[model samples]
Target: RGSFVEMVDNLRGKSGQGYYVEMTVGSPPQTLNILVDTGSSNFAVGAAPHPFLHRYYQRQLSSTYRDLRKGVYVPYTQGKWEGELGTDLVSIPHGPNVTVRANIAAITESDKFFINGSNWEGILGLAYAEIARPDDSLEPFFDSLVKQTHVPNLFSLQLCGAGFPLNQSEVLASVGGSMIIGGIDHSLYTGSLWYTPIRREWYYEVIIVRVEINGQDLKMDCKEYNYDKSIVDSGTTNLRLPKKVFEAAVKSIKAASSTEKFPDGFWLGEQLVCWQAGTTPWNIFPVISLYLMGEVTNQSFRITILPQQYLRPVEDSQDDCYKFAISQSSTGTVMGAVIMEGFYVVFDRARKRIGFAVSACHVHDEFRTAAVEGPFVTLDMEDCGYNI
Candidate 1:
């Protein structure tokens, strides 16, 4: 059995944008706040100190820190970092005080990296080692935990949703969710864990067979639209869809709900679609189903999301409005936290698969009863809908 790590929400950043975990480096643990990102595969600390961060990874302070006499560079969607390669002892807060020697980049130079005002001093990349920087492209820190430390080669993330608006301070102190490093916590979710084969190990890429709205297939035509694959990313906040698929999805929602769409600037900020406040999304919005590739016999793993998961209250709008959690992307489709918040996701590298199940966010007798029956549970409620 592996250990569990608590991941808190970064209210200082994008307000429920990402989850962060606290760790220590070197002989005597020096606290380091790191963002947990599955989208990238490099662990590096910021070179410069910021007002928000309490401590930065100072190589000089760590007695076990070793410089490999090599420089590394990495580029990401929002920013890039070039730093010196090194190895040091890293320790998690709640784990058996297991301090493991791990590879890390002590960033000396960076560009456009500090755009987000996050308290995290670095990032803990959870992707495969193939995508890591060449110089320090050794197995990721987590991988070492699995092999060397004999922890489970599995990690699970449960991100909480911001139900109401809060100021920056309140957002910072919010308890987002928990992160299990070496094992699974059955109590956090309801029903059996549904598995899907990972199409590629680089990212959490999986086959998206179909996408339906309100039981009607949106006719996404993955191959035709070059959207056959979808990446489950925790780093992104909004659900990104291919250009054509996004247009089609919005059109369908407009037709089905008959909700008036707000014009650009009037409601559109970062999100594309918005509707008047007090609009009962469950009554108007459709239930979206993402059909993933299942085992040989099952053939398909279905994950459905209700309106509450897709429609969020617009913060600080003079006129009451709610924003759709999805956006158009020219590159490819990504299933971000907006869609992921409704379920429990498990990234199992040992078996090269990903798992999904309905999250146990609500405490009810029905959910409690379903939890006792076994892994498979069927949720048929008016507020939320699920079938597995």
Candidate 2:
């Protein structure tokens, strides 16, 4: 809510709070915290001065625990850490829970990155990223889910708020109501579905040709067309924009509003001109549009680009020039989850494509499950403070 980086950090912690079905690195019933994230890969735990675990978990500790002197040093943005890679047992809890032998890493020296009070655990990355060294590899966690179990290699997210479907109004991001190996909750989605190939290393790229706002076409010159590497990322919540397009679109919006000031983000009950003077809820039938290239060879995909609330006027917080809201990195804009709701998103990494289907995108009405284990401030188990 404060800044983009801060939001990312907060979401990372939220994503980590989930059930992790893992087997002992040696014995049975090996207990550890396993996080589920779409932005990264690799299943690793913070192993430092954590409190004593039950005999079941301690006995299952990998033998590598005694030979840390030979373990490889792994460095992260936080600092240098240590970990060991090996195959072990993994399970995804369910009625007929999936359990299989898989490769995993046990962090031996995560002193700089310990979850306070909570069970000392590692994160399991499910997004499309390279987890191994040197050469790239399929995200090991998802790979295991698909290969080891009968689960379909697909990912879905049901967020919180008033607009989410009924079946997906739970805590866990389900594989499918029944099982990933089975099928998605039937009540969640309906009608025809579209599929696009997954492209590049980070996002699923899809062709966007033309755009229409409120039934009016807004054409972009060839050079102005910002179709390079468009990604569909669920990790983000808002539609990100580049300076040029963001400025142009906001200019049009401000012209329509003709207002001197406005608030940040969208909310109800505010008599904002961006809401079209209450004539139209700027969010519902927004005055924005986006078109795909080539794919809309004959017909264009009428996309609601973003509303005035989501469109922050580009103003220098210091200089007071409403030209661009904030400058992140210069590149193509990321269409975050806010605009991505209601649309059935298909992130086909293997095919190098992304597809979207239109629907009513809203937050889930119920409070999904959120489990926080351990004490609130247990210990910062980072390695910089203590030496092996």
Candidate 3:
């Protein structure tokens, strides 16, 4: 499996909305922009008409489409979908050349899942099958393809986010993230690849040691940062922290730069701060660091997000406006696009670990959005692992 690589480019869209890749399906092949999501594991496509989608997969048109008669349902924070399971031939037009008979959900109905003028018509789940709904026996698209093609059980992704676009047409006009299916591309990253163990097979779970603002620790119990768990997810839009950790982080950030004018709820992601174009108050804001425990005992590493990365540019705003990309969460501490956009992330599933390195694309002109460090000797800490 070494040295084998399949490149998937033209993965465009926005950071918050989700990047998409073109997948060709069916006998004659109908291409669809499928959302590339790492936090999920079900391959679903719209089969029924809705006000939001511009095109849908017509099961009747695919000569080899098979009806499995099994119903699949999945619900998320902002969206939920339900449909009948089926089998179809599918392949990534810009990636792997091989087409395989894979399980797919022909979505019959959904709620708030497909927004109006969205670029993605379906979702290409990149997570493990343990989270795959409608029973785990149904193989995920990546698994099915890997079994047949025999690529390495690892894939690397890079999000070349120039700016977060608010309009759908803006996404259509821009080029965004890219995924290398079989192996890592050295040119896409720099520095050493720091790896952390995958605590759970689901959601690329890892232990969060602590968080800091401009090198000042938030000073919460390490476990609280990962109260339920911590995961590096590609689907989620922001760096979401557990309730306790989030509050502390907000307070710490404001304290670091007390002179900046920030409105109430701005840190909660409820408001956008606008300034004259190209006059973002970078000197007033602070950088954030999220430390993840390394596989080795008493060792930890961190990924730093600079102000240019966290303060996402708000599309369509009159001036150069931005929102606080860090969010609060209860289920798990999620390191989403805001954090990931600065590094090249590798899901090394075969080795039970995840790796991160300085992404070459994580820069705009001169500023690097993210910086990675460590494998350093951490304090004598207990249970810097998953928190229940």
Candidate 4:
């Protein structure tokens, strides 16, 4: 969530002919990146075909060898499409090894919305809202394993830029992102229940009551300009704050840190920052306290404002291991995934709501299936061959 990517060509797309599956995007189109996301569904890119279009879209493309004219038309803000949707085999070598024959819609609706003047060429919609076929609408990508193999197939994402690998090699690099399978994570968050209604657009919205700090009420509700909606986003890693809330929180942290140089961005420990863990001060941290309206189920839900070191430097740092810094842009507040790590987030889509429960989240350990005893180690890939 703290990561950002540059949308170089607003029309031709970021990566020439290569298509990005469902990915993440920072607020304000400038900080857009191709994220490997499977949580929501839609496979949207940063800049679309039209400037007037909504922030997100489900584009249909035509992927035929000779039938260039045989395509379906999808509607957008600027114009319509005239392309066809066909199946393309998608193989994630080290990751989800199952071959997914996905729909690649060939768009040829109108030239008015083309890249320079039209929509970008590559966009694959993975959201349930715009399933390519009616039969596959309710079927998630990993649902096939549940029906056929009778085994829960997990879809794990490791963002390539943020020190995470593009495939299955390293362990920690693939720590983040959503995992869709037969059952939820058994050990991510506690099993306490809290009710928060969902909003209509842009991630599932949850109602937040008041915020507390170390058992003390921060008086968030009493404040005149309070933001009631708190979104539970698998894509975002930080808790975004409004202008007033941002200033207040930063000011509180600054006063607590006793240091005037708190970086013009968020920071970790110092003072006003603490997660369920202990305290650690750094730059661009996002420690937040959210209270739900319902009952006194748990004491509090505190998440750390990860230090600035977690942020991967863009053009400044040539090293890939470096994390990204939070955007200083004051568009609004967003609670990204940095705080969501090691927690089981259940999104009850049908009920139009979501909640959190802590779990051991052994999935990470299971995914890191390599075994080592003393100094000798065995490579699991060798036993399975290159056919993971």
Candidate 5:
């Protein structure tokens, strides 16, 4: 039997930029707030030494720290991390004082895109080790934890949105969320967990059979749509869709809008679409459904993003608009945190699968208890009724 650790996720940025967790590094641990990213597999801390990045990995102080004498570069959609590779003791201050000797990248140079004006120190990649940089060959933090400590082989993420309307007050307030390392929190979600096999170990990639808006399929060709795969990424704030699909989705959403479009173009930025505030998005925008592959034939397991999930109120205005923030991409779809906020996601690396169920965000009392509850519950295809 293994013990699990749970940490509360801090939601930062005005429009729910990303969810981050606090962890300590080195022998005489230095606490750091790192972004919990599933998109990539490289754990690196910011070395900028700025006020925003107060606590970062300092190689000088840690007795257990060992410099790998290697330089590494990790590229992301918006930015890249160029740093030195090393191994150090990483600890989680929450539940159990679980610490493990893990490989990490100490970022010395970062692009403005990577900065994103975030107060967080760095990123903690939660994806499979196979996707890690070849030369770096770093063991993912979670993988190292399972092998070194009495931790299980899985983890879960619960991301809470930063209120309906984007407000400066809510941005500073502590939002409700959790990250359960090593097990599932049954109380965080309602109904059984729905399981889907991972198409690629590199990411939490799954086969997306189809994407529907208002009960209408976005693609005309079923073959092309079924062939497409989607990566469930927590690092991304907005959904990135193929150009064709994005155009279609935008047209559909605009068609349903009761208020006239703003003269300043449709998008406020790359990630947000703007519209009149008084307009009820639930009544105007269509519910989006992502049909994912199921283990059994005819088993319907989909991640549904409600109208509310796609709409966010404009900052300092009474106007609300669709928040899908669909962006054009040459690659396949990336289902980001906005769409994931409605579900309790389980990244089961041991089983090579991902699980999801309707989130119990409305139920507030169960959060802290679920974070520290004992005797972990492991769900299988049968448990979620995905196996027939």
Candidate 6:
């Protein structure tokens, strides 16, 4: 079957940052940029006008739009949205020519979901229906597309963002990357794809073994690492670990690094650390390792990220400022953009596994940032898998 490769836009809207792609929705066919969010399962669009929206789909204008009267309320880490459920014909111009009837949310009211500089007008969920709003009865857009078209049941993403280029998009010579439905582009990755079994269907959930800071483990209960769930999300901006895990990781990094005496807000997640332009101490930061249990071997493998990948670059600032890219999560670990920007990730839904390979876009000459290593046997670590 032919693959549907869609070009995504790496957009930033003050508080909102995501990789968005254009989808033609409605019978009259309105083109709008939709956030490619793997962490969610809702195919919602801006059907009504909002202060932060540049364009919206006029439900009255679409002859084929059907309202089901069911209401949907979805809350994110910092935003909430409520919309009426509806059905509409949607097609991907970069995808197959076929158009399918998909469950859509005509978002009537939303708060903090949109802001100025936001390029996306909607969101496209790539996960399972377990977390689907209004329940699992509703099918996501990709599922509908697969049933209606010849596209396969899987997709791949390469979010081409490494630093905090939010304030300075021009710094990233190439910002947006590709999201291919039903196929893996070998050209985008090197070596072989490392496979990790999907522990569950919701949110592309997977099992993570350990997080090593400069080869030293936090030496806590493995459950602390995965609190409730560990998801790979393209919508999130930073790499977030469970609160305790984040705390330990931060303490270890500070202890491991040489440069000290920065502001209290820098490590407190309130401010950024700046330096004279071109004198930024990239060497002061340490390389962090994420260990995942292999799907094929059940052995442990490590993918390491360098300082450049974890430090958010503050462009257009008076001096070169960098924000600590890691955050604290209440539930579980979130391998967000800070982690994904260094690798080419594949959601192997058909086989119930996730694949990771070094991205073609991110390359470092002196020291590798997103290098994969391991197949070592994992000892008696605690069961940290998220179960229903």
What's each prediction's TM-score? 0.83, 0.55, 0.94, 0.46, 0.83, 0.92
Location of the lowest summed lDDT over 10 successive residues in candidate 5 = 366-375
lDDT of 4 at 231: 49
Q: List the pairs of residues colliding in candidate 6.
A: 164-313
Q: Give each model's whole-structure lDDT.
A: 0.66, 0.39, 0.81, 0.34, 0.66, 0.77
Instruction: State, as a TM-score between 0 and 1, how close model 2 is to the true structure.
Output: 0.55
| Candidate 4 residue-wise lDDT, 48-144, digit = tens | 4445333432323213112223335445433544555433333322233344433334343454433431122334332244333333443433333
- In the range 119-165, model 2's lDDT, one tens digit per residue, is 32665555554534212452466667677677556644322122211
Clashes of each: 2, 38, 0, 57, 6, 1
Off by over 4 Å in 2: 1-36, 48-86, 94-96, 103-124, 129-134, 162-183, 211-218, 221-228, 256-260, 263-288, 292-328, 348-355, 358-388
**lDDT tens digits, residues 1-388, model 1?**
2224332222123324466777788877788777777777777887556554566788887789888898887876667788888899998785534778898888777776643546678888888887778633577888777767877788887666655454568656766666777767777687778887777787787766667777688875444233544688877777777788888877777677776455544223355343355433456666677776664533665787765666654564534445667777765678887676777789988888988878675212221211111222222111111112
Better of 1 and 4 by TM-score: 1
Error of 5 at 376 (Å): 30
Ranking by TM-score: 3, 6, 1, 5, 2, 4
lDDT of 1: 0.66
Residue-level lDDT tens digits of model 3 in 1-388:
2232346345787676777888987988988889888888889999988887889899999998999988988888887999999999998876766788899999999998876665789988888888898777888888898898877788888887775445656667776867888778887788889998888886788887878898898888788877788888878889898898888888888888798768887877988888877776686778888888787888989988788777777764458888899888978788887778888899998898999998777744354457889867777545755443
Over all chains combined, what TM-score does candidate 4 have?
0.46
lDDT of 5 by residue, 169-250 (tens): 5554665477888788776777668777887687788766656776676764433442255688888776777666677777
lDDT of 6: 0.77
lDDT of 3 at 159: 81
